[PDB]
């Protein structure tokens, strides 16, 4: 399949749920991090600054199995330990309204394809 480049005007859903033609801005890559929760229960998408125990912004990730502090989706903060760190690649795009998005390269369409 094909390869997506900056500059490409390409086929996205915008911020209202519709399909529209978008420019790819810049190709970015994010990092996310897994943790185990003390319950058992998994998060394979936070963000490097969610980790409250530690700075990894400035120093980089934890240990594997390192035990952490996470605050979470309901702003409390919960024991952890650390699982590992997945880079992905992704797609910065811009709507003729101005508005932008980072998306998946699954979320993006060529203007020869089909939808969906």
Avoid at 24 to 46: A, I, Q
Avoid at 48 to 63: A, H, K, R, T, Y
Avoid at 95 to 115: A, I, M, N, P, W
Wanted: glycine share 6%; proline share 4%; hydrophobic share 35%.
């Amino acid at each position: 399949m094909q390869s997506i480049t900056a500059g490409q005007k390409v086929i996205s859903k915008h911020k209202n749920g519709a399909f529209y033609q978008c420019e790819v801005v810049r190709l970015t890559t994010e990092t996310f991090y897994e943790v185990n929760f003390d319950d058992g229960s998994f998060s394979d998408n936070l963000y490097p600054e969610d980790i409250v125990s530690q700075d990894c912004l400035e120093f980089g990730p934890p240990d594997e199995g390192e035990v952490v502090q996470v605050r979470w989706t309901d702003g409390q903060v919960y024991g952890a330990k650390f699982v590992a760190s997945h880079p992905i690649q992704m797609y910065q795009v811009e709507f003729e309204d101005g508005s932008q998005l980072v998306v998946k390269r699954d979320d993006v369409y060529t203007l020869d394809e089909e939808l969906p």
